[PDB]
Ligand binder design. Structure first.
Ligand SMILES: C[C@@H](O)CP(=O)(O)O
Ligand SMILES: C[C@@H](O)CP(=O)(O)O
Ligand SMILES: C[C@@H](O)CP(=O)(O)O
Ligand SMILES: C[C@@H](O)CP(=O)(O)O
Lengths: 193, 193, 193, 193
C-alpha cells in the first residue's frame, strides 16, 4: 500500500501534465512498459534517488507522488496507557537535563507530539537553551515549580511557574526549563503541534 | 487598527481585481470619495451587512478584507497562572457534568483551546455524549480513573483510563466521559487544536 | 447572509472557548440578551470595530467569525461573454500603459483574476515596473511581440517573447511589459491565481 | 538532492518524536549506525517501501520526509517558446478529440498546468465527457466557437461560447468541448491551477 498509493498518484500526475507511458519513459530513459509497471503496483523497489528523478521529470515532488501516512485510529480514537510510554533520556553537555515520556501520537496528526517531561536540574544558572523548534508548543506545569527561560540565551526573559501554570511558546522561539532554584525537580506536560 | 487593516486590505483587493474608486463606488452605490475614505481609515463604522456587500462586489469574503487576529505574545510566549483561569460550569440535562478550567490561549493559535476539565459524574450509564466537534483533541488523565465513550451514542465504544492515560479524539467524533463507576470523580487535561 | 453566517460562527466560537452568553457579554460590556440576539441573526448592524473587538475577545479574527464569500457558480461553472467584460485604463507617470479586460471571476476562487491586457507602449527604455504582487501569475502572449522585464527595476533581466510564448512569474517579483520596440502594441492574457 | 533533503528531514523528525538513533533503528530492524548513515545523506538507495515503513514508524508520511520539488525559476521567472511546447494527442473511443499543447510549468507551482487545446471534433451529440478532475480550471476560447458541456453526462448543461469567452470550472466537475456544430474545429486555452 506504500507501493499502491504511488501506483495511482503516479498515474494521476502523468495524466495531469498530459503525458503517456511512452512520453514519460522517454524523459526518464525507461521502457514504456517499465512505467506501466509502476502504475500497476510494481513501483515498490524504486530507490529514493530514482523517485527524486521521477518527481523531477513530472515537475512535482516525491511527496506529491506518495500516499499520506495511513490512518491508525479505532473509530476516531487512540489510547495509550501509562506503562507503554516511550522513554528518552535527554542529556545536554553530559548533563541529565530532561527525560521524555512520550505520550500518544497519531498518523492523522503527524505534528501532534504530546510529552510528559521530567525536568531534572534545579539550577537556573545552568539552564540549557535549544535553538527553538518548528511548531507551537503548549506547556502545563504538572508538578513542582518550573523556572522557564526564553528568547536570547545571553540575555533571556524569565518566569517562575507554579504547579498548574500554562504556557504557549511560538514556534522557533528558544527556551529552557529547570526546577525552581534548589527545589530539586519539576514535571511538565509539553504538547507540540 | 481593526479599521486600518481594512483600509489596506480593501485597497489591495480593489486594485487586485483592477478597479478604481469610481468603478467600485458604482457597484456599491456610493460616491467615489466615500470609498477613498474607507481606504484611508474611516471604514470603522461600516456595518456587518455593509461589509457583506463590499466583500460581495469585490467577489471575495469579509474575512479576506479584514486583518488577522493581532499578536498577543511577549517575545513568543504567554503565561497564565492557576488562579486566573476562566471557569465555566457545564450542565447537561440539568446535571453538573463537567467544569471547564480554561487554560492559556493565544490569538497566534486561535484553534488552541487548552482545558482542565473536572469530570463530576461517576455513573457511566448516564454519560452524555456531545455531537462531536471540529478540531482534533488530545486528552490526558490528570487524576482519578476516567470512563470514556466515543462513536454512536446508542452502541458506543468504551475505555477505562487510569491516571496518566493519554488519548486522541479525531474531529467530529462524538464522545463522553465520567469518573470510573462509583469512584466519585476524575480530572482531565483536554487540548483542542 | 453575513448576519446569519456570523450568527452561526459566533455561537460556535463562544462554545469553543467555553464561554456562555454571560461570560462573553461581560468582556464586551454588553448584556447576555444582546449576545444571544447576535447569535440569533440580529448582528447585522454591528460596526467593523465592534466586530474587531468581539473577535479579539474571542481570541480570534473577524474572518473566522464571518461566512465564506459564497457560491456564484452554475452547477460548477461560471461563464462570461467578450462584450460583458470590465475595463480599466492603467496609467503610470501620466501615460496609458495598459488596458485591463477583466475575464471571468468567482467567489469560489477569489484569488483567481484572469485578464486580457493590452500592452499600449512600445518603448522598452520607458518600461514601468510594478512592485511585484501577491500570488503567482501565468501569462500568454496573445498578439504582437512582447518585451518583458522582471526583477530589479534598476537592473532587470529581459526577454523578447513571440506570440504564443508562455511565462510564469512567482509572487512579489516585480515585472513590466511593452510591445517589442517600435512594434506599436502587443497583447497578453494574464492569470493571477 | 533527494538523499540530502531526506537526510535533513529524517533527522528533524526523529528528534521531533524524541527518538535517538538506537530507538528508531530498533523499530526498523536496523542498526543505529545505519540510521546515522541515512541522516548523513547515505539513504539514496532506500526503496519506496522501506521509506514507507520508516515514515510509518515515525508516525508520518513519506512526503514529510522528502524535499520540495525544487526551484527551476530564473530570478522568479520561467519562459517557454511556442516551438518548444510538448504535445499529446487525446483520443476517446478511438477518435482524436483534443491535441494538448503544453505551456510553461514549474516546480514552484506543480498544480499549475496551462495548455492550448485544439478541439478537434465539431459534433456536440458525440461529445466525450471527462470525469471531472482535481483542481479548478480557467478557460479562454482562443479561436472558433466552442460548444461546452458540463455536469451530468447523461443530462449536461450547455453553452455556445464565442471567441473571447472565459469560463471557470470548479474541481471534480465533469465537462466536454467540441467546436460549434459543423464549424469543424475550435481552440481553447485551459489553465489548471
Ligand atoms: C519542554 C520542552 O519543550 C523543552 P525542549 O524539548 O523543546 O528543549
Ligand atoms: C473532555 C471534553 O472534550 C469533553 P466535551 O467538551 O468535548 O464534550
Ligand atoms: C501583465 C500584468 O501582470 C502587469 P501588472 O498588472 O502586474 O503590473
Ligand atoms: C479543456 C480540457 O480541460 C478538457 P479535459 O482535459 O479536462 O478533459
Amino acid at each position: 500500500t506504500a507501493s499502491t498509493g504511488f501506483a495511482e498518484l503516479l498515474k494521476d500526475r502523468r495524466e495531469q501534465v498530459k503525458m503517456d507511458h511512452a512520453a514519460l519513459a522517454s524523459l526518464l530513459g525507461e521502457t514504456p512498459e517499465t512505467v506501466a509497471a509502476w502504475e500497476n503496483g510494481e513501483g515498490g523497489e524504486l530507490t529514493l534517488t530514482q523517485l527524486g528523478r521521477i518527481a523531477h521529470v513530472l515537475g512535482t515532488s516525491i511527496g506529491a507522488l506518495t500516499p499520506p501516512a495511513g490512518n491508525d485510529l479505532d473509530d476516531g480514537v487512540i489510547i495509550q496507557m501509562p506503562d507503554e510510554r516511550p522513554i528518552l533520556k535527554g542529556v545536554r553537555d553530559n548533563v541529565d537535563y530532561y527525560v521524555y515520556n512520550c505520550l500518544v501520537r497519531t498518523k492523522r496528526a503527524p505534528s501532534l507530539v504530546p510529552l510528559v517531561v521530567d525536568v531534572l536540574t534545579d539550577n537556573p544558572d545552568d539552564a540549557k537553551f535549544n535553538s527553538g523548534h518548528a511548531g507551537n508548543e503548549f506547556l502545563f506545569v504538572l508538578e513542582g515549580e518550573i523556572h522557564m527561560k526564553w528568547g536570547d540565551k545571553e540575555n533571556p526573559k524569565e518566569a517562575l511557574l507554579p504547579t498548574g501554570a500554562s504556557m504557549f511558546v511560538e514556534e522557533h522561539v528558544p527556551h529552557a526549563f529547570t526546577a525552581a532554584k534548589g527545589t530539586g525537580s519539576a514535571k511538565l506536560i509539553a504538547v507540540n503541534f
